[PDB]
From a paper:
[name] receptors are chloride permeable, γ-amino butyric acid ([name])-gated ion channels that are responsible for the majority of fast inhibitory neurotransmission in the mammalian nervous system. [name] receptors belong to the pentameric ligand-gated ion channel (pLGIC) superfamily. Here we present methods for the expression and isolation of tri-heteromeric [name] receptors and the cryo-EM structure of the rat α1β1γ2SEM [name] receptor in the presence of [name].
Inspection of the resulting density maps were consistent with these resolution estimations, and in the case of the density in the extracellular domain ([name]), the quality of the density map is excellent, allowing for visualization of medium and large side chains, as well as glycosylation of Asn side chains. Thus, we propose that the conformation of the [name] represents an agonist/allosteric modulator bound, activated-like state. There are three substantive densities within the neurotransmitter binding sites, at the interface between the β*(+)/α(-), the α(+)/β(-) and the β(+)/α*(-) subunits, an observation that diverges from previous studies suggesting that there are only two canonical [name] binding sites located at the β*(+)/α(-) and β(+)/α*(-) interfaces. The oval-like densities in the two canonical sites are well fit by the chemical structure of [name], although the density feature at the β(+)/α*(-) interface is weaker than that at the β*(+)/α(-) site. In the canonical binding sites, [name] is wedged between the β*(+) and α(-) subunits with extensive interactions with residues from loop C, loop B, loop A, β2 strand and β6 strand. The amino group of [name] likely forms hydrogen bonds with the backbone carbonyl oxygen of Tyr157 (loop B), Glu155 (loop B) and Tyr 97 (loop A) and a cation-π interaction with Tyr205, while the carboxylate group forms possible hydrogen bonds with Thr129 (β6 strand) and Thr202 (loop C) and a salt bridge with Arg66 (β2 strand). There is a well-defined glycosylation site at Asn110 of the α subunit, within the extracellular vestibule of the receptor, at a site of post-translational modification that is distinct from the other [name] receptor subunits and not observed before in any Cys-loop receptor.
Residue numbers in the entry:
A (entry chain E): 10 to 217
B (entry chain D): 25 to 232
C (entry chain C), E (entry chain A): 12 to 221
D (entry chain B): 8 to 217
The structure:
């Protein structure tokens, strides 16, 4: 009743093509990944297949509402009507958002403005493999999480939760390899075009 | 064109982006599936494929119409105009719907507001062969589903029939193991986004 | 010039969501199949391949007109703006709709009101065989199809010609390496599910090794 | 002046019926094929197919797209191909085909002051080739590629090779690792079905196993 | 607040299908690349993988503006409206324009009218390989690209920096396992086509088997 017109006024006059705080401070984007599987670490093709619950939370002042003391989990057909960051993966080869019944994509608004975003992505990511020690070698295959068209003067990345920003890794079992450790890396990467933020999630793979 | 009158009148003032009981009730959904086939258990990728007719049933109070027809049968054209709950198979590698010849989406609307909606879905799930005894195999092969965005406060899955609720077909559906029965559970799994209800379906198999 | 005035008239009041004669007669869909090439039978996957010009025809009382031409060979963009049946192959695994320079569809609306909506498909479907006699055996690969959302009280499928003369295999249409396509046999049929009694058109392809 | 051009381009697209072929209800309009073979990619005696990449070009004289002020051969964006009538030309023996989408969909729309529309496509066809494996060192194939309209009878459109023998370009510049092109031949043919009669251009060529 | 109102002033009256300068001077597109990795060569079907940041720049005088921001860093949803050229790879037999959360495309409109536009690609371009010296290979795999529908009199490709410096490979990124990348070599040519005359940017990669 009352909720339907508040959602309709958040989408009235909304300009998707400009980010929050456009022409101002960088919008702060926090990330979290729930690792689902390390399916196919191929030694011939030098890649690994990762299924993950990719999650993004950022502040957006254009999407705040006064009343309604609850969180508006909207349908996934609103994310093409909202601004989302253009976060790619630097070392992907084949990737897709899962379309099981509908497209697996979460939009959960909040009464202050913190848009919560979610995806279920299966990523075939490539990694360098040193095959000198052919048994019992550690691989350290990573996943560079980077945005495409926003310099660090427009966005900032961080692992939302610090060390507890990556869950579900300890529950993974591989038949040949074994997860010994993982670590999260935050940095800035300079190109000819600009300076882009990069998150890096590493996986050392002690082969049995 | 008398059905065109009452079908168009269910569309104005109807937001596709909001679940029906958005503040009041947890919007319980009755579900069942018809197992059309269970394909080869490869188990090198820990994968078995399964073809089902996955059906859903919920009550939309915005879709009550006055009793002119008892229930009107819709094609796959009004699914995009009506709120459809997200449902994802948690262990699915590649759960692809069947889209051939005006896709397999069935939709019924009663004057109570009850909505029957089903899909034809082929899946490939996670199932380890449990290789303690390679000739004397046993397997569980779960198939579980949830909503990706709506927590247990906002969505509730429930079986129609108590403790079975799942049909089956003639057992000539390319199974190299022994299909011996069904069992299903209901679990609340805590994640970061919230607490989600999980509807596990088990397909007990054994090699012979 | 004139035909644009016709086609802009045939959609005022028309509804995609309703079969012709809702609350009335059932709709009779006259299904024809022209097999372009019966593809290779995969024995380990236990499924075959077939390329069909899946034809189907039905009468709509909302698309009548009195123009200068009797049959209007329209485009496939028109077919998404009229009602089409929801036929699907009950045993089909990975059925691709052939999309090309335009999608391979057709729509010839007639001043009587009868339609003609054919599709170029590659449907692959299950063919369970019994390997008790492995080097020399003969079995029938089924191709079942019927409606998905409409029961026998809404739609009823039929064959266009006689059932012995409906499914047509081509002369050069044999992509087989091991088997020999020799004959086919169709019948009607009713498969009742949890919703209702759906009509199912069963087609068997009898074939033997070499 | 770019302001004069937009007034004419909007004039050609206001009043245009995409679902009507040009001279609808009159004489058939002639569509001329032009094929620039890029490569024979992957010819395989396991799946009985070969992969062909080419520049499928086709031209037809339509009446509605004519202008008088601009002396230029107006080349528009490729998103105008989604706004105009193009033929539903398919390839009857394809198995999997796609238009290359590397930066955009590789389509050419080049209008003319006369009324000739030029339409290009960089498409990759995995056509099926029935190959006789009688003797293996001397294979001597004949792998065809069949151009045919889908939804238009021979009194709706008609096909020809734009340039006779010179419509097919680049086959002499193919370097296959295990095969050799000794001849290629373009065949115009008319093929009838139950639905109607259809024009059929056939591009065929002989292979040789080394 | 304000920047919404200024994007509509640039897009009202702008035609999405007309290149900047039709009937005027030739559009000069300035091409830069950045090879993020040089993927593994395939000796079987004679190809290689490469993923680049494929940069382009041209002056659209219809998009000049006066605002408080110097340049406008906009989404890929903006880039679907602005005219962008049709740059296809002549060797690419399969390519993936990557999208993960949005399409990986940035559009940066400067105040002057010039605008940078790049995309993250992956090109499975093919090498005509000479295997007469199979243990001691020394190849030069081309990466030709140019326009599809626009003639040399309509668009002209140029390199942004000096042409020896206008191609960059990543310092620590290459997925070669049997070869090694000796270095790059660019060239600029003209292909005489059956449609017209097209500028072609050629890029070579010199390899040697380890
Ligand atoms: C990276 O880029 C690629 C390429 O651009 C993107 O791929 C495209 O993604 C879009 C968005 O999801 C898809 O569009 C939607 O497609 C729906 C189904 O299309 C089917 O098309 C053919 C058969 O026609 C199949 O081959 C397809 O199968 C492929 O896609 C699935 C998706 O998971 C894969 O799993 C498969 O393996 C295949 O690869 C598709 O099944 C289509 O229904 C939908 O159109 C409805 O909705 C939109 C907006 O709401 C409107 O156009 C319209 O309202 C349509 O609704 C009508 O029809 C429905 C039918 O139920 C009714 O309910 C309505 O009332 C109404 O009448 C939309 O077009 C597109 O198909 C897909 N293309 C390909 C080649 O995959 C990636 O997504 C992208 N990745 C990112 C961004 O991460
Ligand atoms: C089979 O082949 C046919 C080729 O005829 C193909 O049909 C085309 O599909 C595309 C979409 O894939 C259609 O393009 C759409 O056109 C509408 C018209 O208004 C636009 O509004 C759409 O814009 C959306 O996407 C834009 C991308 O730039 C964005 O601006 C925005 O997000 C919009 O939501 C969209 O461009 C095209 O019109 C048809 N052509 C026809 C029907 O003639 C079909 O998709 C193929 N099927 C497959 C590959 O499964
Ligand atoms: C092997 O895996 C480890 C982790 O398992 C990764 O090493 C990380 O490499 C990055 C960049 O190469 C470095 O991160 C740095 O962290 C400091 C703070 O500690 C920060 O100030 C810097 O800006 C930089 O981002 C660092 O060497 C290391 N970091 C961590 C947390 O281990 C990497 O994936 C693999 N490293 C090698 C050498 O193979
Ligand atoms: C590969 O095989 C096909 C058929 O087996 C060959 O096509 C045939 O080509 C001949 C020579 O042109 C055609 O005969 C003539 O056709 C013309 C034009 O259609 C007609 O005017 C003549 O009266 C005569 O019939 C023949 O029709 C055609 N066959 C088919 C089925 O189209 C093809 O030539 C072979 N490939 C090579 C490289 O030789
Ligand atoms: C809506 O979402 C917000 C964001 O998480 C919730 O606020 C936090 O909830 C968690 C767990 O419930 C706790 O840390 C605090 O209760 C909240 N933290 C802060 C900093 O406010 C909020 O509870 C959600 N609303 C509902 C009704 O569940
Ligand atoms: C515009 O297109 C027409 C049609 O192709 C061109 O006219 C042809 O020009 C070639 C020159 O290479 C002649 O060999 C043909 O005989 C011409 N055909 C006709 C029907 O005139 C014309 O040259 C093009 N003009 C421009 C400026 O691009």
């Amino acid at each position: 009743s009352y909720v339907k017109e508040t959602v309709d006024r958040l989408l009235k006059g909304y300009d998707i093509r400009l980010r929050p705080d456009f022409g101002g401070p960088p919008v702060d984007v926090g990330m979290r990944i729930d690792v689902a599987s390390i399916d196919m670490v191929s030694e011939v093709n030098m890649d690994y297949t990762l299924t993950m619950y990719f999650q993004q939370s950022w502040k957006d002042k254009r999407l705040s509402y006064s009343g309604i003391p609850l969180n508006l989990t909207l349908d996934n057909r609103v994310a093409d009507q909202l601004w989302v960051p253009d976060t790619y993966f630097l070392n992907d080869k084949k990737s897709f958002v899962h379309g099981v019944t509908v497209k697996n994509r979460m939009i959960r608004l909040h009464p202050d403005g913190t848009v919560l975003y979610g995806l279920r992505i299966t990523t075939t990511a490539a990694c360098m493999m040193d095959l000198r020690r052919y048994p019992l070698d550690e691989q350290n295959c990573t996943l560079e999480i980077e945005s495409y068209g926003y310099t660090t003067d427009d966005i900032e990345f961080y692992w939302n939760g610090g060390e507890g920003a990556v869950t579900g890794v300890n529950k993974i079992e591989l038949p040949q390899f074994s997860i010994v450790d993982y670590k999260m890396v935050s940095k800035k990467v300079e190109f000819t075009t600009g300076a882009y933020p990069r998150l890096s999630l590493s996986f050392r793979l002690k082969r049995n | 064109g008398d059905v065109t009158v009452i079908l168009n009148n269910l569309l104005e003032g109807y937001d596709n982006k909001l679940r029906p009981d958005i503040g009041v009730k947890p919007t319980l959904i009755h579900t069942d599936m018809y197992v059309n086939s269970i394909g080869p258990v490869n188990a090198i990728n820990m994968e078995y494929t399964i073809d089902i007719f996955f059906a859903q049933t919920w009550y939309d109070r915005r879709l009550k119409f006055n009793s002119t027809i008892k229930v009107l049968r819709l094609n796959s054209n009004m699914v995009g105009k009506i709120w459809i709950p997200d449902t994802f198979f948690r262990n699915s590698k590649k759960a692809d719907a069947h889209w051939i010849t005006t896709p397999n989406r069935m939709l019924r609307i009663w004057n109570d507001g009850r909505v029957l909606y089903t899909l034809r879905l082929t899946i490939d799930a996670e199932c380890q062969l449990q290789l303690h005894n390679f000739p004397m195999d046993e397997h569980s092969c779960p198939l579980e589903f949830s909503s990706y965005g709506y927590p247990r406060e906002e969505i509730v899955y429930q079986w129609k029939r108590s403790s079975v609720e799942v049909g089956d077909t003639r057992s000539w559906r390319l199974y190299q193991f022994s299909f011996v029965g069904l069992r299903n559970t209901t679990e609340v799994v805590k994640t970061t986004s919230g607490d989600y209800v999980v509807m596990s379906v088990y397909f007990d198999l054994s090699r012979r | 010039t004139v035909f644009t005035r016709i086609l802009d008239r045939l959609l005022d009041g028309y509804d995609n969501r309703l079969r012709p004669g809702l609350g009335e007669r059932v709709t009779e869909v006259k299904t024809d199949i022209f097999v372009t090439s019966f593809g290779p039978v995969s024995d380990h996957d236990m499924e075959y391949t077939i390329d069909v010009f899946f034809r189907q025809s039905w009468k709509d009382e909302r698309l009548k007109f009195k123009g200068p031409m009797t049959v209007l060979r329209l485009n496939n963009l028109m077919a998404s703006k009229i009602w089409t049946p929801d036929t699907f192959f009950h045993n089909g695994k990975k059925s691709v709709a052939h999309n090309m320079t335009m999608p391979n569809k057709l729509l010839r609306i007639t001043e009587d009101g009868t339609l003609l909506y054919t599709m170029r498909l590659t449907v692959r479907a299950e063919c369970p065989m019994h390997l008790e006699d492995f080097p020399m055996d003969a079995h029938a690969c089924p191709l079942k199809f019927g409606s998905y959302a409409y029961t026998r009280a809404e739609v009823v499928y039929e064959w266009t010609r006689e059932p012995a003369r409906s499914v047509v295999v081509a002369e050069d249409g044999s992509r087989l390496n091991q088997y020999d396509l020799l004959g086919q046999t169709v019948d009607s049929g009713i498969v009742q599910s949890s919703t209702g009694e759906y009509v199912v058109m069963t087609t068997h392809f009898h074939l033997k090794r070499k």
